[PDB]
Amino acid sequence: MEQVCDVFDIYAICACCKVENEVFNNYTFRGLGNKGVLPWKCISLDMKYFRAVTTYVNESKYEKLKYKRCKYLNKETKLQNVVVMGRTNWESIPKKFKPLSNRINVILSRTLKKEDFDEDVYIINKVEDLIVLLGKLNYYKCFILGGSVVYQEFLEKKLIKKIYFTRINSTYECDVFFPEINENEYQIISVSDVYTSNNTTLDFIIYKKTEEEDDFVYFNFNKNKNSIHPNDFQIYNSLKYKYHPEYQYLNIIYDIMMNGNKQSDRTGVGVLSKFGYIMKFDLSQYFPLLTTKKLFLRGIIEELLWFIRGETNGNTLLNKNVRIWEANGTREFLDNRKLFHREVNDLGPIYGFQWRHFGAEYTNMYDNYENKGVDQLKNIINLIKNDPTSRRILLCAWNVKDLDQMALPPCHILCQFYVFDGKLSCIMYQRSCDLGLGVPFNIASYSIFTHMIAQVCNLQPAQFIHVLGNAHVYNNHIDSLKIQLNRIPYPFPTLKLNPDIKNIEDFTISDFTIQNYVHHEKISMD
Amino acid sequence: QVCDVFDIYAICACCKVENEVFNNYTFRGLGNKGVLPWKCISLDMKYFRAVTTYVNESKYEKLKYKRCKYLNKETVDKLQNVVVMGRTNWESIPKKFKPLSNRINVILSRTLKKEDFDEDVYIINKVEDLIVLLGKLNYYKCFILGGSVVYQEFLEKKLIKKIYFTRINSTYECDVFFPEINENEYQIISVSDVYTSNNTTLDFIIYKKTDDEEEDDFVYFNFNKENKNSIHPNDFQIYNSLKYKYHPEYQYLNIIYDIMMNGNKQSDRTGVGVLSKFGYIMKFDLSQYFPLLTTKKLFLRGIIEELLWFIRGETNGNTLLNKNVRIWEANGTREFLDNRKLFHREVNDLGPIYGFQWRHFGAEYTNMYDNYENKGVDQLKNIINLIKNDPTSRRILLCAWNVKDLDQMALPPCHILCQFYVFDGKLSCIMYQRSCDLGLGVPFNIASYSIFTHMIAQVCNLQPAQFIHVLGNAHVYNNHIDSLKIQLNRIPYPFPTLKLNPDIKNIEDFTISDFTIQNYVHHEKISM
Ligand SMILES: NC(=O)C1=CN([C@@H]2O[C@H](COP(=O)(O)OP(=O)(O)OC[C@H]3O[C@@H](n4cnc5c(N)ncnc54)[C@H](OP(=O)(O)O)[C@@H]3O)[C@@H](O)[C@H]2O)C=CC1
Ligand SMILES: NC(=O)C1=CN([C@@H]2O[C@H](COP(=O)(O)OP(=O)(O)OC[C@H]3O[C@@H](n4cnc5c(N)ncnc54)[C@H](OP(=O)(O)O)[C@@H]3O)[C@@H](O)[C@H]2O)C=CC1
Ligand SMILES: CCc1nc(N)nc(N)c1Cc1cccc(-c2cccc(C(=O)O)c2)c1
Ligand SMILES: CCc1nc(N)nc(N)c1Cc1cccc(-c2cccc(C(=O)O)c2)c1
Ligand SMILES: O=c1ccn([C@H]2C[C@H](O)[C@@H](COP(=O)(O)O)O2)c(=O)[nH]1
Ligand SMILES: O=c1ccn([C@H]2C[C@H](O)[C@@H](COP(=O)(O)O)O2)c(=O)[nH]1
């Protein structure tokens, strides 16, 4: 008829870390505590979150809660929340925080009774006594704070209506663990933005138990296009709040699937296409390596270093077993570009040559172009250092003169940089965007490049901003992207650079570390 | 009050009538010679039927409750709306539409007999008889449909809760007019998107008499979202008093507001100081309007000449100056060039700027008088050919940022590139701007590249779709702040329209006389 946890609004809130090429799932985050305390030193942002949720009340909503609880109990006609702790949980809290401020404190125990406590707290020695207590109290909501024993038995008994679950994206030694959530009993309905706090990333997810209004209608008086189906996005559409920054990428895919224009293309596969998007990623808070599928970064980092050296020799990448440019360097591909006098894997005056030698005459991939052309990479590093408010800090790969000599014209047209308050942001304009295959890597590439330029200019990375021009999904990718859109992102990883690298030319592959990459399974887009 | 008890609204449509000053009264034409002043404008008709038939039955129980208590009753003893038409208005409606479908028809008439119409059609003979009739009916809301007499008397009797006012942005001969809405009595609260229907733009404004399981979760996710810039948002009383701000000019205005509220204080070369942010997109639908800002006056002749000068490939600033187009004057002075270290550059020789790069990218620049025929890459020709011959190309770009020539330019281009996109016979254009003077430069820039998109689309036999503006370093000069505060609190008018001479089929064949702005309605000019 009614559930106890719905009448009395019984929630659980917790924070779980990871515990010691692996496979990941929701149970990856399950570390609760260690040796009777928390596994980590204070993660302060989670404490602020935990305090806002457990202390927040809305007075205007109590009368309905009050009415509803009377009806269930068969009774007639400042506000605070109730919080429930195991006895072990209670003893691990620092004394200066007890009783938890502005909350009604309740402790479960058998070995201790109210005579053993100095504080303003309720003792109860069984779960049934909490329901009795709640029927007699005036309160807004009831939050179960753990520990592990308390969680397990409240989940066991179907007494939890929502789990407020912080995912701590780092590994610690643990000896107690959140119960394995039964995906048939609970589903994720919301996921927050990603944050960094105390040298770890984290997000907040929510499991749920499984007049001027008419003017709006008037103004919408004038509102199965692409053969895409509802049930094919059930998980994606069931989420209420989608604040994880990975949704900037997934929503654009959704948008192209549901509203894109059908078109042919140079390749003949055919695409759905739209025109003009912007994504923004906060590199101060996370490294935006996509988590709804597995991505590798060694190739794109070697590519970036190969760019910065000004190289155009495709053999250099192939010798590191990086095959990104291999198809663009074959005799057949070059011939079909009319590059009949071009040696195999000589890609012509592409990215690297334009960044270090714009306007120089290209000869072959072995020439020494020292002091030919405009070394715009050096120029923009100098403007950032010495003229940070300049609105001319731009790095351009679209050299109109050289386009036909390139193996193919650049997609990443330009980077513009912005400096404020000791922090560096970067816009990259992409003329053509393969959303299913290329954009994931391109986000990672320029995100890394922003870190490198910021460090050698002694700035901190801020936003990477990604403007998409012709944004398209290949029809060959649609079934894979349907799978991918129905996965829930994980908290992003972090990127660390060797801090002793002071000049842009001095990085090597080993100066980069990606830490705490948690990700869904690899996907063949075909 | 009566009109709040019984939910009495007015709904009307007004055209313009036969340096002009504009105001809300500019739109006041109701009828002419017993008919509507215009041929049918189908979009306003669709909105009309929608407003006057829409009913939310779940919301009626409280309206019935409210009306009964007002009348000291307990009962009123399918929910439709009520519609009130004057007799002139009622008789001039085509026969096959009367009685108005799914509406309770009510007619003010001192000469019509209750007999000649069915029992479902009501006939009153004074205004207070409607209040009596509303006391005895079940209805959602009561709409006053006109005509001029009915508007005037209902309005001077303070019997109107809101006005749903369609602004028809064209001119017609009229002999009856809406009453001048006293802005001390009513005020605009919501403004719609701009539209094109039957060869006129129009918009829709609203005048006003003067699971919470997921509500809490919203609060928690805001737990860290703890105004910073010495701006007092009470200076934007009108702006923040609006409820629905759907006019596409709000794309521009919302960005000024964002930079004021949240911009970063930075200095610049002139010491003036700016508020800046990084990264915006605006999109304007050229199929439905020409986005010439209306919250201040904008002139376009110089803007068009500069474009034509670009297309000719010119770099000689004297050409513009002899036409009194002075956009580039300050960049061509002896002093400005010397500061650029261009010691060997003639005054007003701007070097290899836009026009030279569009028609001659990669050519060696000598001076502004040289013959550059067939030197360098003719990008403009190239992209026009790609549009016509390979329209699904993702390489249709027009780039002015020639890294090799920047230092020889009087200054590097602010408009880095245009990219084009073709689908189903329609042309859209993205322009990326590295540096955006929101107060002065950006309004002109939206117009320049909106026009350019029309020109490219016509010489390619395409229709213009969107113009899409990407702002890089976006700034408000500190000395514009007072002027933009005034501008944020003006309500835009429906946009004008751009017409090109349809005979021009080559990008190089346009002349100044081939461009006409139609029905530009605007607020007064502002010195920034
Ligand atoms: N990261 C997080 O989100 C959280 C972490 N933690 C960590 O978890 C650990 C503590 O959790 P845990 O070790 O599982 O111990 P708990 O905090 O779960 O409390 C255990 C004790 O609570 C009492 N108790 C539990 N259920 C009942 C009941 N039905 N009736 C009566 N008394 C009851 C008993 O106390 P008695 O023995 O006196 O009967 C039991 O021994 C610590 O490491 C703590 O720091 C704690 C909370 C949340
Ligand atoms: N686009 C728009 O927004 C609208 C346009 N129109 C146009 O408006 C024009 C009509 O202007 P108008 O002539 O002012 O139309 P009206 O309907 O305002 O004519 C008023 C009539 O209503 C009756 N009436 C007025 N006041 C009273 C009263 N206090 N008590 C009783 N009966 C009353 C009289 O009928 P009697 O003669 O029997 O006394 C009078 O002739 C037409 O050209 C029509 O096309 C129509 C509706 C709205
Ligand atoms: C890691 C923390 C945490 N985060 C989240 N999201 N859920 C949790 N169940 C906990 C653990 C917890 C439980 C009970 C009280 C405290 C506590 C500590 C110190 C001070 C206070 C206070 O309220 O001042 C509370 C922590
Ligand atoms: C110019 C139109 C208009 N727009 C708006 N916004 N307000 C208006 N007062 C009118 C004029 C009007 C008034 C009464 C009935 C009709 C009518 C005509 C033909 C058919 C129907 C119908 O309902 O089928 C109604 C028009
Ligand atoms: O870094 C890259 C390089 C290529 N592409 C994709 C976009 C297009 O699908 C294709 C290039 O095609 P053109 O736009 O040049 O035709 O490769 C990317 O998304 N990112
Ligand atoms: O067409 C133009 C030309 C200039 N500006 C403004 C932007 C900057 O305020 C200034 C450009 O100077 P720098 O970005 O080079 O500093 O001119 C525009 O907004 N639009």
- The residue length of chain A stands at 526
Instruction: Give the closest-approach CA distance of B524 to chain A in angstroms.
Output: 28
Contact present, B24 and B182 (Cβ < 8 Å):
no
User: In terms of C-beta density within 10 A (0-12 exposed, 13-18 middle, 19 or more buried), how is residue B260 classed?
Assistant: buried
User: Which residues sit opposite A472 in a β-bridge?
Assistant: A273, A434
Residue whose Cα lies nearest atom 3 of ligand 6: it is B414
Per-position b or e across A463-491, b if 16+ CB within 10 A of its CB: bbbbbbbbbbbbeebbebbbebbbbbbbb
Q: How many CB atoms lie under 10 A from the CB of residue B321?
A: 15
B258 membership: H or E segment, kind and range: helix B249-262
Amino acid identity of residue B524, one-letter, is E
Nearest-5° Cα angle at B504, B502 to B508: 150
Amino acid identity of residue A359, one-letter, is G
Residues of each annotated binding site of B for NADPH: 13, 30, 32, 34-35, 87-89, 109-111, 126, 147-150, 153
Residue with tokens 């028609």: B359
Residue whose Cα lies nearest atom 13 of ligand 4: it is B145
Say how many Å lie between the CA of residue B391 and the centre of ligand 4: 43
Q: Look at strands A512-515 and A494-497 and give their pairing.
A: antiparallel
Instruction: Give the closest-approach CA distance of B400 to chain A in angstroms.
Output: 9
Minimal-distance CA residue of chain A relative to B466: A275
Contact A218 B204 (CB under 8 A): yes
Question: Longest C-alpha distance within chain A, in Å?
Answer: 93
Amino acid identity of residue B178, one-letter, is F
Name every residue whose Cβ is closer than 8 Å to that of residue B389 and which is 6 or more positions away in sequence: none
**A-interface mutation test, from B46, B222, B403, most A Cβ less than 10 A away:** B403
User: In terms of C-beta density within 10 A (0-12 exposed, 13-18 middle, 19 or more buried), how is residue A510 classed?
Assistant: exposed
| A146 Cβ inside 6 Å of ligand 3 | yes
| B131 Cβ inside 6 Å of ligand 4 | no
**A-interface mutation test, from B49, B165, B220, B255, most A Cβ less than 10 A away:** B220
DSSP letter (8 states) at residue B430: E
- Phi-psi domain of A481 (left: phi exceeds 0; alpha: psi -120 through 50; beta: other): alpha
Residue whose Cα lies nearest atom 18 of ligand 4: it is B93
Residue A178 belongs to a domain with what CATH number? 3.40.430.10
Amino acid identity of residue A129, one-letter, is D
Residue whose Cα lies nearest atom 23 of ligand 2: it is B109
B200 membership: H or E segment, kind and range: strand B200-209
- Domain span including residue A180: 4-209
Distances in Å between the Cα of A89 and the Cα atoms of A56, A148, B39 are 22, 9, 77
Contact A401 B164 (CB under 8 A): no
Query: Active-site residue numbers of A?
Result: 411
Amino acid identity of residue A131, one-letter, is I
DSSP letter (8 states) at residue B316: B
3-state SS of A474-511 is EHHHHHHHHHHHCCCCCCCCEEEECCCCCCHHHCCHHH
User: In terms of C-beta density within 10 A (0-12 exposed, 13-18 middle, 19 or more buried), how is residue A499 classed?
Assistant: exposed
Contact present, B419 and B396 (Cβ < 8 Å):
yes
Nearest to A243 among B221, B246, B419 (CB): B221
Contact present, B500 and B515 (Cβ < 8 Å):
yes
Which technique was used to obtain these atomic coordinates? Answer: X-ray
Cα separation, B357 vs B375, in Å, equals 11
Name every residue whose Cβ is closer than 8 Å to that of residue B407 and which is 6 or more positions away in sequence: B341
Minimal-distance CA residue of chain B relative to A277: B281
Radius of gyration over alpha carbons of chain B, in Å? 28
Cα separation, A203 vs A195, in Å, equals 6
Instruction: State the closest ligand 6 atom to the C-alpha of B436, by its place in the atom list counted from 1.
Output: 19
Cα separation, A204 vs A200, in Å, equals 13
Structure tokens at A458: 């002694």
Cα separation, B34 vs B89, in Å, equals 8
Instruction: Give the closest-approach CA distance of B235 to chain A in angstroms.
Output: 24
Contact present, B287 and B257 (Cβ < 8 Å):
no
Instruction: State the closest ligand 2 atom to the C-alpha of B31, by its place in the atom list counted from 1.
Output: 43
Nearest to B281 among A276, A396, A431 (CB): A276
Cα separation, A41 vs A43, in Å, equals 6
Residue whose Cα lies nearest atom 7 of ligand 3: it is A14
Q: What is the resolution of this structure in A?
A: 2.3
Instruction: Give the closest-approach CA distance of A75 to chain B in angstroms.
Output: 24
User: In terms of C-beta density within 10 A (0-12 exposed, 13-18 middle, 19 or more buried), how is residue B247 classed?
Assistant: buried
Instruction: State the closest ligand 2 atom to the C-alpha of B89, by its place in the atom list counted from 1.
Output: 17
Ligand located closest to B274 CA: 6
User: Which residues sit opposite B197 in a β-bridge?
Assistant: B200
Q: State phi, psi for A478 to the nearest 5 degrees.
A: -65, -45
Residues of each annotated binding site of B for NADP(+): 13, 30, 34-35, 87-89, 109-111, 147-150, 153
Radius of gyration over alpha carbons of chain A, in Å? 28
Pocket test for ligand 5, best of A411, A445, A467 (most atoms within 8 A of CB): A411
Distances in Å between the Cα of A1 and the Cα atoms of A4, A6, A7, A72 are 10, 11, 11, 10
Q: Look at strands A81-86 and A103-108 and give their pairing.
A: parallel
Nearest to B404 among A280, A359, A472 (CB): A359
Contact A391 B243 (CB under 8 A): no
Cα separation, A85 vs B309, in Å, equals 76
Contact present, A195 and A203 (Cβ < 8 Å):
yes
DSSP letter (8 states) at residue A302: H
Structure tokens at A202: 């984290």
Task: Kindly give the interhelix angle for B213-221 and A44-55, rounded to the nearest 10 degrees.
Answer: 150
Amino acid identity of residue B293, one-letter, is L
Q: How many CB atoms lie under 10 A from the CB of residue B183?
A: 13
Structure tokens at A485: 């859109």
Find chain A residues with C-beta within 8 A of B225's C-beta: none
B275 membership: H or E segment, kind and range: strand B274-285
Distances in Å between the Cα of B239 and the Cα atoms of A31, A51, A238, B277 are 50, 36, 35, 21
User: Which residues sit opposite B283 in a β-bridge?
Assistant: B468
Cα separation, A109 vs A123, in Å, equals 7
| A144 Cβ inside 6 Å of ligand 1 | no
